[PDB]
Amino acid sequence: AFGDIQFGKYLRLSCDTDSETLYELLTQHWHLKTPNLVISV
């Protein structure tokens, strides 16, 4: 179950969850879209 841990908010995403749906929900609910992004490994 998702929770807004404070000590931001974190929500677990299922491996089978669609990327499009989760991205759309995140953009509509949390904050604006990103003109650029960097992923660090």
């Binding site: 179950a1 998702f2 929500l11 677990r12 995403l13 299922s14 969850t17 749906t21 989760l22 929900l25 609910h29």
Partner: peptide
Amino acid sequence: DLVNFIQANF
């Protein structure tokens, strides 16, 4: 709402 969207995503 946000809770409903989270539940649907789950």
